Amino acid sequence: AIILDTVLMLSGSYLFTAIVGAMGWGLIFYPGNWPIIAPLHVPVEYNGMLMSIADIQGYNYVRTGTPEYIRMVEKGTLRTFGKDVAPVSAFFSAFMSILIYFMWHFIGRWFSNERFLQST
Amino acid sequence: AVRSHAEAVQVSRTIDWMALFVVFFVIVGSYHIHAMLTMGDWDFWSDWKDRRLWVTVTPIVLVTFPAAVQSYLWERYRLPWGATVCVLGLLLGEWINRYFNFWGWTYFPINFVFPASLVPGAIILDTVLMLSGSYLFTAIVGAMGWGLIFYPGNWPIIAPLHVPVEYNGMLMSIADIQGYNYVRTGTPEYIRMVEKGTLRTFGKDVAPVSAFFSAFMSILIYFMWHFIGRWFSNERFLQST
Amino acid sequence: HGEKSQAAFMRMRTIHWYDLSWSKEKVKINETVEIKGKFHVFEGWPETVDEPDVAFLNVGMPGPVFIRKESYIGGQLVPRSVRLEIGKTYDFRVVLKARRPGDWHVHTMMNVQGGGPIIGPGKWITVEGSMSEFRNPVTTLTGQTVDLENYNEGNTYFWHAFWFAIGVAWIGYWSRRPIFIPRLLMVDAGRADELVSATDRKVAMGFLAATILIVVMAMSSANSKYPITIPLQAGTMRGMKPLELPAPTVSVKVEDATYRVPGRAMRMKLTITNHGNSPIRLGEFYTASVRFLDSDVYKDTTGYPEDLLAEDGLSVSDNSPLAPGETRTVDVTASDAAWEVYRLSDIIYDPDSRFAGLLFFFDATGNRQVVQIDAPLIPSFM
Amino acid sequence: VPRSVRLEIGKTYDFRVVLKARRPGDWHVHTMMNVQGGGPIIGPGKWITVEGSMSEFRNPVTTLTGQTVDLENYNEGNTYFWHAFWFAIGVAWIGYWSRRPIFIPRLLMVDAGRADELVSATDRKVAMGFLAATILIVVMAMSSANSKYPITI
Amino acid sequence: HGEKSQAAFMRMRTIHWYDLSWSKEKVKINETVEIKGKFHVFEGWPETVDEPDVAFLNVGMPGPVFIRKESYIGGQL
Amino acid sequence: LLDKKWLTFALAIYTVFYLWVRWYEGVYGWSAGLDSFAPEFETYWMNFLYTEIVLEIVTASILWGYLWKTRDRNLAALTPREELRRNFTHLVWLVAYAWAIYWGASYFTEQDGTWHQTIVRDTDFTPSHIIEFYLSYPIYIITGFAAFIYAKTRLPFFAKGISLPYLVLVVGPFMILPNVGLNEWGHTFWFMEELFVAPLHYGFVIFGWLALAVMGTLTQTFYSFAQGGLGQSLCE
Numbered sequence A: 001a002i003i004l005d006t007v008l009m010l011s012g013s014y015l016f017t018a019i020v021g022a023m024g025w026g027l028i029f030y031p032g033n034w035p036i037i038a039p040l041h042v043p044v045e046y047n048g049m050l051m052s053i054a055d056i057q058g059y060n061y062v063r064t065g066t067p068e069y070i071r072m073v074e075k076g077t078l079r080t081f082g083k084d085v086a087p088v089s090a091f092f093s094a095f096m097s098i099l100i101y102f103m104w105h106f107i108g109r110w111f112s113n114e115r116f117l118q119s120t
Numbered sequence B: 001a002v003r004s005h006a007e008a009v010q011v012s013r014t015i016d017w018m019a020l021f022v023v024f025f026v027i028v029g030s031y032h033i034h035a036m037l038t039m040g041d042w043d044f045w046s047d048w049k050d051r052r053l054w055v056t057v058t059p060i061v062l063v064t065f066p067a068a069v070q071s072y073l074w075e076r077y078r079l080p081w082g083a084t085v086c087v088l089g090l091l092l093g094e095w096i097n098r099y100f101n102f103w104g105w106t107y108f109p110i111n112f113v114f115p116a117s118l119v120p121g122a123i124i125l126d127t128v129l130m131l132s133g134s135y136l137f138t139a140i141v142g143a144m145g146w147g148l149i150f151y152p153g154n155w156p157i158i159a160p161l162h163v164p165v166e167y168n169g170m171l172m173s174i175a176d177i178q179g180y181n182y183v184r185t186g187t188p189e190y191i192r193m194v195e196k197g198t199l200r201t202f203g204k205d206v207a208p209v210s211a212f213f214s215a216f217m218s219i220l221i222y223f224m225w226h227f228i229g230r231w232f233s234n235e236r237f238l239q240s241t
Numbered sequence C: 001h002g003e004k005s006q007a008a009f010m011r012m013r014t015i016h017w018y019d020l021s022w023s024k025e026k027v028k029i030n031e032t033v034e035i036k037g038k039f040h041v042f043e044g045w046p047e048t049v050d051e052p053d054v055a056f057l058n059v060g061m062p063g064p065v066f067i068r069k070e071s072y073i074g075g076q077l078v079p080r081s082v083r084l085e086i087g088k089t090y091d092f093r094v095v096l097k098a099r100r101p102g103d104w105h106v107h108t109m110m111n112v113q114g115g116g117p118i119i120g121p122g123k124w125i126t127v128e129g130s131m132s133e134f135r136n137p138v139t140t141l142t143g144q145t146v147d148l149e150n151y152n153e154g155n156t157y158f159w160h161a162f163w164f165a166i167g168v169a170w171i172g173y174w175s176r177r178p179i180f181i182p183r184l185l186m187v188d189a190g191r192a193d194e195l196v197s198a199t200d201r202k203v204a205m206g207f208l209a210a211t212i213l214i215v216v217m218a219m220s221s222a223n224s225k226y227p228i229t230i231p232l233q234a235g236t237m238r239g240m241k242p243l244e245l246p247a248p249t250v251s252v253k254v255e256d257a258t259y260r261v262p263g264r265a266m267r268m269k270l271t272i273t274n275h276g277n278s279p280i281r282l283g284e285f286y287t288a289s290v291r292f293l294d295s296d297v298y299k300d301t302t303g304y305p306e307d308l309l310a311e312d313g314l315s316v317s318d319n320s321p322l323a324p325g326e327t328r329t330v331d332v333t334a335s336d337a338a339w340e341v342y343r344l345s346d347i348i349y350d351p352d353s354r355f356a357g358l359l360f361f362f363d364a365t366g367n368r369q370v371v372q373i374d375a376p377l378i379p380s381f382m
Numbered sequence D: 001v002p003r004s005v006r007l008e009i010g011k012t013y014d015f016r017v018v019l020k021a022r023r024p025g026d027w028h029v030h031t032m033m034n035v036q037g038g039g040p041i042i043g044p045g046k047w048i049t050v051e052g053s054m055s056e057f058r059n060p061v062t063t064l065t066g067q068t069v070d071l072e073n074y075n076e077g078n079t080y081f082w083h084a085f086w087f088a089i090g091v092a093w094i095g096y097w098s099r100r101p102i103f104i105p106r107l108l109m110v111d112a113g114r115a116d117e118l119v120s121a122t123d124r125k126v127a128m129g130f131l132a133a134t135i136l137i138v139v140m141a142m143s144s145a146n147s148k149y150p151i152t153i
Numbered sequence E: 001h002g003e004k005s006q007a008a009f010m011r012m013r014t015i016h017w018y019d020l021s022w023s024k025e026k027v028k029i030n031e032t033v034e035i036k037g038k039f040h041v042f043e044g045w046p047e048t049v050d051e052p053d054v055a056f057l058n059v060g061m062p063g064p065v066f067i068r069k070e071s072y073i074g075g076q077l
Numbered sequence F: 001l002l003d004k005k006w007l008t009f010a011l012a013i014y015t016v017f018y019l020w021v022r023w024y025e026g027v028y029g030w031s032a033g034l035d036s037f038a039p040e041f042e043t044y045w046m047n048f049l050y051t052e053i054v055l056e057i058v059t060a061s062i063l064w065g066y067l068w069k070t071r072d073r074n075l076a077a078l079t080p081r082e083e084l085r086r087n088f089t090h091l092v093w094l095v096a097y098a099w100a101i102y103w104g105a106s107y108f109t110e111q112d113g114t115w116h117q118t119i120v121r122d123t124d125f126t127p128s129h130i131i132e133f134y135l136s137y138p139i140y141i142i143t144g145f146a147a148f149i150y151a152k153t154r155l156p157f158f159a160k161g162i163s164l165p166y167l168v169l170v171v172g173p174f175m176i177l178p179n180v181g182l183n184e185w186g187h188t189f190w191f192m193e194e195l196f197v198a199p200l201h202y203g204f205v206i207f208g209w210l211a212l213a214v215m216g217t218l219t220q221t222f223y224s225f226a227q228g229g230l231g232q233s234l235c236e
């Protein structure tokens, strides 16, 4: 949010914001949350299976309505090359954030309308 | 300004050649990106040049740029070759890549990696626009012809590749044997979106049905892209970005 | 050349290639090299990979440096995609004809419709000669022999050049006169109605009529010649015949499996129960294209790739012969530079730290038993 | 089976679930099977009484890095600290801009003529400082969280 | 009356009908005619046809010139 | 003088550099460039990526900064002859942009096809990924930005406002470069089939369409050409 706001105030161009600030907004998400979730990714040998601390949390604290298969998380693919999962997702999110910011700038432009629709 | 009438004519001719270069090669880049990422796989391989998917998809996605460039060039200059210049640029880019990369870098034969022919459809689209200048008439009749003439236009090229061959106990066309022999490590056979037969495939109708569907969808896409090109021609000055 | 980048656990548990053989290591142009072997579809097929309902037997190679003359699954030719069953073992045979000189790393691979490429072991094969000597003859059912290297090339070039010339002629006809700025000014300032006048309309009518007539005539001529044509032959082929392997007489239970981070070794504790009537000995552990061998028990003679072969990479704590009926638990260590070269150590990055492999047990007489093992793989750091 | 599993139609499986009491009360405990595309299949439920205090509950676990943590409160302080820190940064930005009049005078200034007066140095310098500090703090925090906990999966 | 138009190979490799029998060849109104037989689902089921996970035993006829009183697969309705 | 030989250099520099790039990738495509974890891959393609990214950033900064710093302050006192000369120079810039757009979006893009559809694939930085996404794309982006800046800073027609068609023509093709993120997310995860017509290819395409704004850009340049020195002759 701070990146998006400062990149808008400096260089007041909304196009420049949508391109650069939205890029930064998408890219800084995971590094911004890494200090919080990193301790939860310590590996644990849990009853014969390798599990992260977050995995053990999800296993232990039963969510009756939320079975494990509903979890849409990284599961590996045959086209996952090397250690690229997080950066690739971050860059894809940044590009799509550029697109969504461009769309929603004009959506907000419309929502600001001060028109008086004479009759409903 | 300009010195005289003659110097003005020379300057206009130089501008004509330079702007023709700019139009042609920007169209080459953009149209080739669009084509190769909307019909490229069928255009790459003779064993992908089938009667259902190739015939269906190629005219539909390839009528896009001709419609826009026509809506600009005809409207602003009465130049009736927007479709032709688009198709020629696409063919030039495709052939350059086929010869210098498909056959140059990798060593796939040209008779395996040749592109499809589109000039007949482009000529129909351009002439139907110039005659009867109606853009609606063009979108209805010329796009119909563009969709319908695709497969007959390419039949002289691909017909020799459809000669049946008895290959190690199995029936295969020459294009099938080309795809089998010339290994595409990244392109397994199942990726091939080609006619495979259905229980609702009645008689000998696969090619004409696909051609007519492509012609109708070409009408629709031409109608959409005429207005898309109308927008892209805007000469507005967006005061601030 | 495309593996070492895929996930280690996915390479471990998709398809196990064994009994691989290569007819030749160095070939001439137009000479044939045959690749044989067996592959087993792992029962614990990862959910992220679609089931091998539609699979294609492919060759991993840098473009058509070889041409695939034939390929077989079972004993029947498979030019199309095939259906494989999870848990079944199939034998394969690929015949390649050398086309381009050089040193090529040839892989046998299986492409799965919804999972991507499964690359098997790759072997360096040297090709000598000239590409100009390569021929790919084929005889059609119409009784003519053609070379696939250049057949129809002239016709394709001719037709493409002809249509390109027609389009260029149209454009040049309209380009003889001034093109952009005077025409733009004429259209803008008042009605134009002057830059398109007869015989321009007559020329356009001629172009349209000639285009349609030439297309029709060319189609008719290409129908009179080549009167016999067939559509492209496609469709997944069912009923692949799997190998009817005898039930193994060796049962192995994996009691924990660990690998050091960092390290080049994998350690596991196995409880081996010997059934049947012969003393067995553990001779090999194959995990993902990497064969860890106990040299005192078995030696490879099939010319397996050296970078994938660990001649003494398999160390068993007690590899004495296992009498029938006897059950013992041993510590098995698979250690080789390949474990780090092919990034099998990078399973620590994977979201599923489970391994699978094949254990090969050999008796005194030499007959071998194949047993499959799979268990979680627990990293160890201290 | 900490993850989803594949079951075969017509097969019989035996199961065993181990539960540790955490909250006092009378609870109706069901064994259930969730199917990916069919929803919950609830088995018989049994009333199980739990007595004691929730404050006595412990969920210890030992990691492969050789440390024992309680899953009830592990990382809670770190999470609270980081969230409060970033919330404070955002609130500081907003309050910095909110010390001056906010809505109606600024709207009137923007409407009536060019504004170009409500955003002037050192406002741009403060924004540059905020942006640079945000990026630098994110990078430093990521590096510190990589030096600590060097082993993650 | 709807075959002879489907693909020959698809008609060859989907389902093989044999031991077909018809109780009667000529019937009165309200009279019952029974059709029996066996069908075998071919192992080489074409990939373009979805697997017969959901299949319906139907009657090919020009509208309700007959009404389907009963239909059985195995021995059950 | 009017149109000078800067057009010859504009064509020749791209032609020669890209011919050398094609020679380089023909020599090092196989044999240091197939295995992304081999040490020779680092010395022949990762080093290429690093050097090209640094050089592109430096060249873009220098060129754009020079064009903006040498902007004409007194555009009002510009003679029609000088305006015609500047219009021809801007047309040369547009020609260079068209040539770079061709090389980027047609040649090296369909070389991504020939490459991904024949090689066993391996990283987000295949040699085709170093040449097309991170060399040719950046090069045409730099050329387009330079042409736009030159128009805005030397042509009174393109001054006093940002031309919408020029901005689209300049920025849309630029958006293909960040769209590479969709590409990587579009093969690794979604779609392991090396299809080039997959929806993960839509971001590039959609933004390839924005190059059609060259039509409005070129009619704007025609009007700028025909401001004072429109003739006479034309329409006379």
Ligand SMILES: CCCCCCCCCCCC(=O)OC[C@H](COP(=O)(O)OCC[N+](C)(C)C)OC(=O)CCCCCCCCCCC
Residues within 6 Å of the ligand: A081, A082, A083, A084, A087, A088, A091, F036, F037, F049, F050, F053, F054, F057, F123, F124, F125, F177, F178, F180, F181, F184
């Ligand atoms: C200041 C200018 C100079 C710096 C230029 C940086 C060049 C790239 C650095 C790669 C780091 C590295 O190490 O490679 C990549 C690392 C993983 O590395 P690995 O696990 O070793 O990958 C093994 C394979 N290899 C050895 C060949 C690398 O993550 C990634 O996959 C990142 C993928 C990002 C894809 C989307 C990018 C979109 C860009 C949009 C631009 C507008």
Ligand SMILES: CCCCCCCCCCCC(=O)OC[C@H](COP(=O)(O)OCC[N+](C)(C)C)OC(=O)CCCCCCCCCCC
Residues within 6 Å of the ligand: A023, A024, A027, A028, A030, A031, A034, A083, A084, A085, A086, A087, A088, A090, A091, D139, D142, D146, D152
């Ligand atoms: C305006 C641009 C601002 C960019 C700010 C970047 C701050 C530094 C981030 C270090 C990331 C790291 O350490 O490496 C990559 C890691 C993921 O690593 P992993 O392999 O999935 O393993 C995870 C476990 N770890 C952390 C123990 C290894 O984090 C990311 O997913 C961030 C991806 C986006 C990087 C953006 C920088 C590239 C250039 C951007 C401009 C085109």
Ligand SMILES: CCCCCCCCCCCC(=O)OC[C@H](COP(=O)(O)OCC[N+](C)(C)C)OC(=O)CCCCCCCCCCC
Residues within 6 Å of the ligand: B202, B203, B204, B205, B208, B209, B212
């Ligand atoms: C100048 C005016 C007079 C000519 C009128 C032409 C009438 C149709 C000719 C059929 C040729 C033939 O032979 O039938 C059709 C031939 C195949 O033939 P078959 O294999 O024998 O089919 C066996 C079955 N039969 C014996 C009953 C034919 O292909 C086709 O399925 C073509 C299908 C096209 C569907 C979409 C059409 C959309 C039209 C849009 C209009 C604006």
Ligand SMILES: CCCCCCCCCCCC(=O)OC[C@H](COP(=O)(O)OCC[N+](C)(C)C)OC(=O)CCCCCCCCCCC
Residues within 6 Å of the ligand: B051, B144, B145, B148, B149, B151, B152, B155, B204, B205, B206, B207, B208, B209, B211, B212, C216, C219, C223, C229
């Ligand atoms: C403005 C309208 C212009 C139309 C121009 C038509 C030129 C002649 C084409 C002959 C085709 C042929 O020979 O028959 C049909 C064949 C396909 O045959 P197949 O059974 O798939 O076998 C393939 C192997 N062959 C060739 C050895 C048999 O080709 C086609 O797919 C063309 C389908 C579109 C036909 C359009 C004409 C119908 C009226 C259109 C106006 C409503």
Ligand SMILES: CCCCCCCCCCCC(=O)OC[C@H](COP(=O)(O)OCC[N+](C)(C)C)OC(=O)CCCCCCCCCCC
Residues within 6 Å of the ligand: B204, B205, B208
């Ligand atoms: C308003 C639109 C009016 C258009 C009238 C039709 C003109 C046809 C010109 C001759 C084409 C031809 O003869 O060729 C068409 C071929 C026939 O293919 P075939 O029979 O499979 O084999 C080849 C047999 N030959 C070698 C004897 C040709 O391709 C097709 O299957 C397309 C046929 C469908 C045509 C649908 C037209 C519907 C019009 C509806 C008006 C209300």
Ligand SMILES: CCCCCCCCCCCC(=O)OC[C@H](COP(=O)(O)OCC[N+](C)(C)C)OC(=O)CCCCCCCCCCC
Residues within 6 Å of the ligand: F013, F016, F017, F018, F020, F021, F024, F043, F044, F047, F048, F049, F050, F051, F052, F053, F055, F056, F059, F060, F138, F139, F142
């Ligand atoms: C818009 C701004 C664009 C900025 C990016 C420009 C990229 C330039 C190339 C990167 C090279 C790299 O990174 O690699 C460095 C390469 C690696 O080859 P080597 O192992 O040393 O072998 C020996 C060198 N050979 C294999 C080329 C013979 O060696 C070099 O020093 C040579 C690089 C020469 C580049 C300049 C010539 C270009 C053609 C002439 C018309 C301009």
Ligand SMILES: CCCCCCCCCCCC(=O)OC[C@H](COP(=O)(O)OCC[N+](C)(C)C)OC(=O)CCCCCCCCCCC
Residues within 6 Å of the ligand: A083, A084, A087, F053, F056, F134, F135, F138
């Ligand atoms: C126009 C845009 C220009 C941007 C230039 C790039 C600036 C990079 C700043 C340093 C980032 C860093 O060092 O960190 C990025 C990390 C590296 O992760 P890693 O290698 O997996 O592991 C961690 C290894 N460390 C600890 C040594 C870092 O995340 C990524 O994978 C993202 C890398 C892809 C970058 C794509 C840039 C493409 C630019 C194209 C220009 C034409």
Ligand SMILES: CCCCCCCCCCCC(=O)OC[C@H](COP(=O)(O)OCC[N+](C)(C)C)OC(=O)CCCCCCCCCCC
Residues within 6 Å of the ligand: A072, A077, A096, A100, C048, C049, F182, F189, F190, F191, F192, F199, F200, F202, F203
């Ligand atoms: C405000 C609007 C913005 C919304 C966009 C957000 C991105 C959506 C992310 C999808 C994640 C999800 O929802 O689920 C993820 C699903 C889960 O499938 P799976 O079981 O892993 O399948 C396994 C098959 N693999 C192995 C190939 C993955 O993978 C998908 O099918 C991805 C569907 C593609 C969605 C992205 C389209 C982007 C459009 C780009 C065109 C310009």
Ligand SMILES: CCCCCCCCCC(=O)OC[C@H](COP(=O)(O)OCC[N+](C)(C)C)OC(=O)CCCCCCCCC
Residues within 6 Å of the ligand: A007, A010, A011, A012, A013, A016, B241, F064, F145
């Ligand atoms: C061709 C594309 C290359 C990138 C340029 C895009 C920026 C265009 C934004 C724009 O339209 O102009 C708005 C302001 C105008 O302020 P000015 O009064 O021109 O200030 C000039 C002095 N300054 C260099 C400190 C800015 O000027 C600015 O926006 C700031 C200009 C300084 C560039 C760095 C600002 C962005 C920080 C992330």
Ligand SMILES: CCCCCCCCCC(=O)OC[C@H](COP(=O)(O)OCC[N+](C)(C)C)OC(=O)CCCCCCCCC
Residues within 6 Å of the ligand: A115, A116, A117, A118, A119, A120
């Ligand atoms: C989910 C999509 C977001 C909703 C946004 C859509 C708004 C569409 C604009 C609109 O409602 O037009 C109003 C006209 C009636 O016009 P009048 O009542 O004559 O008003 C005169 C001035 N005006 C014509 C400009 C409105 O048309 C009418 O007939 C009156 C209908 C007004 C309904 C708008 C209320 C929307 C609430 C959901």
Ligand SMILES: CCCCCCCCCC(=O)OC[C@H](COP(=O)(O)OCC[N+](C)(C)C)OC(=O)CCCCCCCCC
Residues within 6 Å of the ligand: B128, B131, B132, B133, B134, B137
């Ligand atoms: C009701 C729908 C039936 C189809 C009619 C749609 C055509 C309408 C197009 C239109 O709006 O008019 C544009 C031109 C006007 O030129 P005119 O100056 O009217 O020329 C008349 C002499 N002419 C018969 C040789 C054309 O006139 C023409 O477009 C050409 C008219 C000749 C018809 C054949 C032209 C199309 C060839 C494929």
Ligand SMILES: CCCCCCCCCC(=O)OC[C@H](COP(=O)(O)OCC[N+](C)(C)C)OC(=O)CCCCCCCCC
Residues within 6 Å of the ligand: A014, A015, B236, B237, B238, B239, B240, B241, F167, F168, F171, F172
């Ligand atoms: C992928 C979709 C294709 C992109 C086409 C969308 C173009 C939308 C039109 C647009 O950008 O409107 C500009 C206004 C700012 O207006 P002003 O800068 O006040 O210009 C005054 C004249 N005008 C209002 C008619 C523009 O709205 C603004 O706030 C400025 C934003 C300008 C961004 C347009 C650049 C598009 C490049 C991708």
Ligand SMILES: CCCCCCCCCC(=O)OC[C@H](COP(=O)(O)OCC[N+](C)(C)C)OC(=O)CCCCCCCCC
Residues within 6 Å of the ligand: F006, F007, F009, F010, F013, F059, F067, F070, F086, F089, F092, F093, F096, F139, F142, F143, F154
């Ligand atoms: C290795 C990189 C070399 C790039 C050299 C850039 C040359 C400097 C750019 C420039 O300002 O103009 C060069 C030429 C001639 O235009 P000039 O008249 O020099 O430009 C200023 C106009 N003014 C004299 C009336 C004030 O204008 C042109 O048409 C030069 C086109 C150069 C092609 C673009 C190359 C970009 C590659 C990334």
Ligand SMILES: CCCCCCCCCC(=O)OC[C@H](COP(=O)(O)OCC[N+](C)(C)C)OC(=O)CCCCCCCCC
Residues within 6 Å of the ligand: A013, A015, A016, A019, B241, F060, F061, F062, F064, F065, F068, F149, F152, F162, F171
């Ligand atoms: C990255 C994606 C770009 C986002 C698109 C936003 C830009 C589109 C509109 C645009 O180009 O206008 C910015 C100026 C044109 O003049 P103005 O926008 O009227 O403002 C001039 C004062 N300013 C240079 C501080 C901006 O143009 C320039 O002055 C650019 C030359 C100065 C930048 C040179 C430093 C950049 C080094 C990397």
Ligand SMILES: CCCCCC(=O)OC[C@H](COP(=O)(O)OCC[N+](C)(C)C)OC(=O)CCCCC
Residues within 6 Å of the ligand: B096, B100, B104, F019, F022, F023, F024, F026, F027
């Ligand atoms: C309008 C685009 C032209 C692209 C031509 C091209 O890619 O050329 C490379 C190719 C390479 O094949 P070849 O000429 O045999 O030389 C091989 C050298 N390598 C392998 C480095 C490309 O052929 C040429 O160099 C011919 C020169 C054409 C000048 C416009």
Ligand SMILES: CCCCCC(=O)OC[C@H](COP(=O)(O)OCC[N+](C)(C)C)OC(=O)CCCCC
Residues within 6 Å of the ligand: C050, C113, C114, C115, F190, F191, F192, F193, F199
């Ligand atoms: C403008 C047309 C977009 C149509 C999208 C499309 O063709 O997607 C095919 C794909 C079907 O996947 P499939 O082709 O079976 O992919 C096979 C390969 N895997 C399983 C690895 C993805 O569907 C989706 O996953 C949703 C696409 C959302 C588009 C906004």
